[PDB]
Short mmCIF file of C-alpha atoms and ligand atoms in Angstrom, two decimals:
data_model
loop_
_atom_site.label_atom_id
_atom_site.label_comp_id
_atom_site.label_asym_id
_atom_site.label_seq_id
_atom_site.Cartn_x
_atom_site.Cartn_y
_atom_site.Cartn_z
CA UNK H 1 -24.65 -3.20 11.58
CA UNK H 2 -27.35 -5.78 12.52
CA UNK H 3 -24.82 -8.43 13.41
CA UNK H 4 -27.41 -10.91 14.58
CA UNK H 5 -28.42 -11.37 10.90
CA UNK H 6 -24.84 -11.37 9.62
CA UNK H 7 -23.60 -14.85 8.72
CA UNK H 8 -20.04 -13.90 7.72
CA UNK H 9 -17.82 -10.84 8.01
CA UNK H 10 -14.61 -10.27 6.06
CA UNK H 11 -12.17 -8.00 7.86
CA UNK H 12 -10.09 -6.33 5.21
CA UNK H 13 -6.48 -5.15 5.63
CA UNK H 14 -7.56 -1.51 5.29
CA UNK H 15 -9.89 -1.82 8.28
CA UNK H 16 -13.09 -2.01 6.25
CA UNK H 17 -15.54 -4.84 6.66
CA UNK H 18 -17.76 -6.74 4.30
CA UNK H 19 -20.87 -8.26 5.89
CA UNK H 20 -23.02 -10.98 4.33
CA UNK H 21 -26.52 -11.41 5.69
CA UNK H 22 -28.84 -14.40 6.18
CA UNK H 23 -31.04 -13.20 3.27
CA UNK H 24 -28.04 -13.01 0.93
CA UNK H 25 -27.62 -9.23 0.95
CA UNK H 26 -24.15 -7.86 1.33
CA UNK H 27 -22.82 -4.52 2.49
CA UNK H 28 -19.56 -2.80 3.38
CA UNK H 29 -18.41 -0.24 5.96
CA UNK H 30 -15.07 1.47 6.33
CA UNK H 31 -12.98 1.52 9.62
CA UNK H 32 -15.03 4.49 10.90
CA UNK H 33 -18.35 2.78 10.28
CA UNK H 34 -19.14 4.79 7.15
CA UNK H 35 -21.10 2.90 4.50
CA UNK H 36 -19.21 2.07 1.30
CA UNK H 37 -20.26 0.87 -2.15
CA UNK H 38 -18.83 -2.56 -2.70
CA UNK H 39 -16.08 -2.61 -5.34
CA UNK H 40 -17.19 -5.36 -7.70
CA UNK H 41 -14.40 -7.36 -9.40
CA UNK H 42 -11.63 -5.97 -7.16
CA UNK H 43 -9.28 -8.30 -5.29
CA UNK H 44 -9.36 -7.41 -1.56
CA UNK H 45 -7.07 -8.90 1.12
CA UNK H 46 -8.30 -9.85 4.56
CA UNK H 47 -6.41 -9.40 7.85
CA UNK H 48 -5.53 -13.08 7.91
CA UNK H 49 -4.17 -13.08 4.32
CA UNK H 50 -7.24 -14.53 2.52
CA UNK H 51 -8.05 -12.67 -0.73
CA UNK H 52 -11.60 -12.20 -1.96
CA UNK H 53 -13.46 -10.83 -4.93
CA UNK H 54 -17.11 -9.80 -5.03
CA UNK H 55 -18.94 -10.47 -8.35
CA UNK H 56 -22.66 -10.96 -9.06
CA UNK H 57 -23.47 -10.45 -5.36
CA UNK H 58 -21.33 -13.46 -4.48
CA UNK H 59 -17.97 -13.76 -2.71
CA UNK H 60 -15.13 -15.69 -4.30
CA UNK H 61 -12.16 -16.61 -2.12
CA UNK H 62 -8.60 -17.67 -3.07
CA UNK H 63 -8.60 -21.43 -3.60
CA UNK H 64 -6.87 -22.95 -0.52
CA UNK H 65 -6.16 -26.09 -2.61
CA UNK H 66 -3.49 -24.06 -4.45
CU1 CU1 X 101 -20.17 -7.10 -1.99
#
């Protein structure tokens, strides 16, 4: 992964990673570095307990206010 152009990574509980790039592209790799299609509309939990959903090429994160 070209981490110098990655602005945010989400480290998922299952060891996969979602990477969001400076130009707005997004990709995913499993724990072995194999590319994955991103599951749109699926709740995914991060290692620190955050939950996210990807929809319309955007990341939505559990509202910390609640
Ligand atoms: Cu995505």
